[PDB]
Amino acid sequence: GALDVLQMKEEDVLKFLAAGTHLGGTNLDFQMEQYIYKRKSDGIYIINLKRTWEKLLLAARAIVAIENPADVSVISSRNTGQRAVLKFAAATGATPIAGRFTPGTFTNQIQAAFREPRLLVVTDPRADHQPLTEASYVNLPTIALCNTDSPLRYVDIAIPCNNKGAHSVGLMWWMLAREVLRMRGTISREHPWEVMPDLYFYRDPEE
Amino acid sequence: MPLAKDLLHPSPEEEKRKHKKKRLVQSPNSYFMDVKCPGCYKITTVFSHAQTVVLCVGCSTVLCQPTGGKARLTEGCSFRRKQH
Amino acid sequence: GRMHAPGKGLSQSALPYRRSVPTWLKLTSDDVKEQIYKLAKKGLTPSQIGVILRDSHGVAQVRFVTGNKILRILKSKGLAPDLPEDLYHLIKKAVAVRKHLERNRKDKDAKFRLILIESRIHRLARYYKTKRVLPPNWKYESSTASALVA
Amino acid sequence: VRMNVLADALKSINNAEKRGKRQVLIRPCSKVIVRFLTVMMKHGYIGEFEIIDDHRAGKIVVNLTGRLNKCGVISPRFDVQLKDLEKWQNNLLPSRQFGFIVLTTSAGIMDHEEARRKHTGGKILGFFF
Amino acid sequence: SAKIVKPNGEKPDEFESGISQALLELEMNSDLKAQLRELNITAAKEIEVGGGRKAIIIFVPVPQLKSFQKIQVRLVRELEKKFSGKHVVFIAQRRILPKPTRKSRTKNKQKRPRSRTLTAVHDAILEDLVFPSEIVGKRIRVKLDGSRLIKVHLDKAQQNNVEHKVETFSGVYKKLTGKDVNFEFPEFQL
Amino acid sequence: MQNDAGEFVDLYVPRKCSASNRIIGAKDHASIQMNVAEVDKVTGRFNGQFKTYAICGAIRRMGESDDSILRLAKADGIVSKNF
RNA sequence: GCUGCAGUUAAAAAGCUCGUAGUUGGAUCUUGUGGAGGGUUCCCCGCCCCUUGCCUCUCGGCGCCGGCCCGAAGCGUUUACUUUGAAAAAAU
Ligand SMILES: [Mg+2]
Ligand SMILES: [Mg+2]
Ligand SMILES: [Mg+2]
Ligand SMILES: [Mg+2]
Ligand SMILES: [Mg+2]
Ligand SMILES: [Mg+2]
Ligand SMILES: [Mg+2]
Ligand SMILES: [Mg+2]
Structure with a gap:
């Protein structure tokens, strides 16, 4: 937003640079060109943070406008985003899908997995292409976290970030939960949040 | 292809990336420069893409060499781009 | 589109929009004309005269300093x-x-x-x-x- | 070569409308292009336009609305004489309620609806609908 | 001198001769003579401005023009502090001729050279109106009611000399020709 | 669409896309009606009124609804400037 | 197949290039308002230079208080184009 209550604070830029979310890929595509600051001395692109923040608050403003919280289905297929989507759906009452997608869940009126969402959030356009291709049949908008080499086909609100590393992905889902819960009422601003981002990170099997 | 690009007010740097003619209004990439021989002393004015051999007067009896592009000065010190 | 060749390239020159003389200039119109006559006497074609004048003197385009093109200048004196x-x-x-x-x-x-x-x-x-x-x-x-x- | 300047000005406008572009650049500019654009803009098929002036023929930048459906040229400038006009606007135009034929008459470049209002034939240039 | 220095200008003129005699006066003094040699003029006129000011035009005979331009700074400041509260602009007085085919019936006179065309003189006027600024770009926006709007783009050097005068350029032009002009200093020097 | 008497003789008036001004047909199962929320300008909380945007299937298929919504929002104070 | 067809694989682009006729050919050379017909700028009379328009006189009918003046003579370099008049048997 244009305001000052919605502006990025110094405590969040440290969370960003600590998770590494500013660090892009090696290849750029001509649709993500407005989100890049400059290519490093070695071949890697820096993502502009102020632009990440504005696209993240636009996604939150798109999610808050849906009345029933339970038709904002969230999807992750890679192993890094499963815990994050499960915790995001818990914190704000969406319906998560981790693992395989079982094509036809959006367009098949027999299956027991058939639902009719009203939004669609997704971790990675290039790894969860089946939900996008199916959303392209039932008038279904889409929000997506994009790496610097993400194809922006059928996505409607791309959020630029490092999409590869587990810490980055969990931090982005945590911040998306923070800002929907903030502007819906609920956990009012001028307080830190009870949950720490590490509840949202990938497990990466332990000792 | 952002589908809403602005053609009338281009970038101050992306309009110097283009060809000399494909830009909005044509402009040459060449320039004129003051050159100093360190020997005799004048102010010879030389074209950047010379393609000729230049002498000062007598003295060094060379001041530039022609190439396939910008001419190179032998040891002509202090060369200044002239302006508009 | 080359006349007798199958190639096509745009290698032409591109003279600028500010068509005024360059504010600095070591010469004036009739000094240029004498500098032209001198080289025309030695057996130089108009193209050679224009290159020689461009490379060693301040004149980027004779026509902006003297009004006339080089060939018309050479004709009005009987030298073409x-x-x-x-x-x-x-x-x-x-x-x-x-x-x-x-x-x-x-x-x-x-x-x-x-x-x-x-x-x-x-x-x-x-x-x-x-x-x-x-x-x-x-x-x-x-x-x-x-x-x-x- | 570029035998016809208006033909490629109109085809480059029309190739960009099919693509959703907000603006086009067309070059070279010409007297007949500016008059045809003014006729097409008086009705509301395009927005404002700007002329970029080099010391040569120049370039135009046009602001495209999404209202234009097709504009085009008739390749030889045929003579049209106020009785052929009905048989011309029954081939080129898509209906009788919209779409215009542009022709040059001795009173300027105008449309057919004004040509009959001023009792003048001329030469056909093109159409837009 | 001061009574015949408006030839083909109907020399007895209150305001024109008023500018004249004072101009020729501070010319004839021995202050600075190496700059001028009592050059002719032909006309002058004071014109109003939308901003509520006064601007006087100096119609120079065109073969003099290059020699007036060799100064153009001492003369303007002197005549300005003499007529303080106004603005001073110089124009070289050129000739428009009717279209040879049809604006006036032909009688097989001559070819009507290009310099005497309407557009050529209308451009040389704008060249002379803003001399120290050396016009570097042009543009024409045709708006949604049929009228046009010209934009001139001048250097970002020699700035502080013209933008205080830049308001009266619009008035001078809209009074001479009839077009709406604007003056800009572009995005950046490129 | 009216007639000379004045009434409106039409089944319905289809909506038009907000990025390309082309109407959205009756069998375009790729067009959306994205709806974004408005905040209360002081505490940054949702309050009723919201904005709505339609995007056609074609320009959504060429990967351009992303940088089109960004422009429809920035033009309209949801983002003000300086994206 | 002018409106209006075809020539990768169904029938079909000369092996390739030059070239006279033929067909085609880049940009550029005057604009607001007073009254007036259609709106509240814009599209027959005339003003920033011209706006049927310069003239050279002459005889014929026209002003006015021997004198004063505009229409009448050339015509706007020409064409194509376009609008309008004239002149084109009936029968069908
Ligand atoms: Mg070519
Ligand atoms: Mg070459
Ligand atoms: Mg050449
Ligand atoms: Mg057939
Ligand atoms: Mg066969
Ligand atoms: Mg065959
Ligand atoms: Mg072959
Ligand atoms: Mg032509």
Whole structure:
């Protein structure tokens, strides 16, 4: 937003640079060109943070406008985003899908997995292409976290970030939960949040 | 292809990336420069893409060499781009 | 789109929009004209005069300093050659090719390129005769053409 | 070569409308292009336009609405004489309620609806609908 | 001198001769003579401005023009502090001729050279109106009611000399020709 | 669409896309009606009124609805400037 | 197949290039308002230079208080184009 209550604070830029979310890929595509600051001395692109923040608050403003919280289905297929989507759906009452997608869940009126969402959030356009291709049949908008080499086909609100590393992905889902819960009422601003981002990170099997 | 690009007010740097003619209004990439021989002393004015051999007067009896592009000065010190 | 070649490139020059003289200038209109006459006396074609003036002196385009183009300047004093150098250089090249052709007759690529050069010569003489620059009884014949160059 | 300047000005406008572009650049500019654009803009098929002036023929930048459906040229400039006009606007135009034929008459470059209002034939240039 | 220095200008003129005699006066003094040699003029006029000011035009005979331009700074400041509260602009007085085909019936006179065309003189006027600024770009926006709007783009050097005068350029032009002009200093020098 | 008497003789008036001004047909199962929320300008909380945007299937298929919504929002104070 | 067809694989682009006729050919050379017909700028009379328009006189009918003046003579370099008049048997 244009305001000052919605502006990025110094405590969040440290969370960003600590998770590494500013660090892009090696290849750029001509649709993500407005989100890049400059290519490093070695071949890697820096993502502009102020632009990440504005696209993240636009996604939150798109999610808050849906009345029933339970038709904002969230999807992750890679192993890094499963815990994050499960915790995001818990914190704000969406319906998560981790693992395989079982094509036809959006367009098949027999299956027991058939639902009719009203939004669609997704971790990675290039790894969860089946939900996008199916959303392209039932008038279904889409929000997506994009790496610097993400194809922006059928996505409607791309959020630029490092999409590869587990810490980055969990931090982005945590911040998306923070800002929907903030502007819906609920956990009012001028307080830190009870949950720490590490509840949202990938497990990466332990000792 | 952002589908809403602005053609009338281009970038101050992306309009110097283009060809000399494909830009909005044509402009040459060449320039004129003051050159100093360190020997005799004048102010010879030389074209950047010379393609000729230049002498000062007598003295060094060379001041530039022609190439396939910008001419190179032998040891002509202090060369200044002239302006508009 | 090359006339007699299958290539196509844009290597032309591009003179600027500010058509005024450059605020600095070591010369003035009639000093340029004398500098032109001097080089014209030594046997330089207008193109050579313009390059020499561009490379060692401040004059980027004579026409912006003196009003007239170089050939009109050379004419208003009676110094232009009898035939323009566009045709002169082509006749010189055709004579050069025909000498080699007379030396070794097993060269067929030289035959082809000579045909193309002469096509250019004819297409240019046909236009120079329309503007009354050449007499209407002018004719490119190989022998008298070798005579013309000298 | 570029035998016809208006033809490629109109085809480059029309190739960009099919693509959703907000603006086009067309070059070279010409007297007849500016008049045809003014006729097409008076009705509301295009927005404002700007002329970029080099010291040569120049370039135009046009602001495209999404209202234009097709504009085009008639390749030889045929003579049209106020009785052929009905048989012309029954081939080129998509209906009788919209779409215009542009022709040059001795009173300027105008449309057919004004040509009959001023009792003048002329030469056909093109159409837009 | 001061009574014949408006030839083909109907020399007895209150305001024109008023500018004249004072101009020729501070010319005739021995202050600075190496700058001028009592050059002719032909006309002058004071014109109003939308901003509520006064601007006087100096119609120079065109073969003089280059020699006026060689100064153009001492003369303007002197005549300005003499007529303080106004603005001073110089124009070289050129001739428009009717279209040879049809704006006036032909009688087989001559070819009507290009310099005497309407557009050529209308451009040379704008060249002379803003001399120290050396026009570097032009643009024309045709708006949604049929009227046009010209934009001139001048250097970012010689700025502080013209933008205080830049308001009166619009008035001078809209009074001479009839077009709406704007003046800009572009995005950046490129 | 009216007639000379004045009434409106039409089944319905189809909506038009907000990025390309082309109407959205009746069998375009790729067009959306994205709806974004408005905040209360002081505490940054949702309050009723919201904005709505339609995007056609074609320009959504060429990967351009992303940088089109960004422009429809920035033009309209949801983002003000300086994206 | 002018409106209006075809020539990668169904029938079909000369092996390739030059070239006279033929067909085609880049940009550029005057604009607001007073009254007036259609709106509240814009599209017959005339003003920033011209706006049928310069003239050279002459005889014929026209002003006015021997004198004063505009219409009448050339015509706007020409064409194509376009609008309008004239002149084109009936029968069908
Ligand atoms: Mg080419
Ligand atoms: Mg070359
Ligand atoms: Mg060349
Ligand atoms: Mg067939
Ligand atoms: Mg076969
Ligand atoms: Mg076959
Ligand atoms: Mg072949
Ligand atoms: Mg032409």
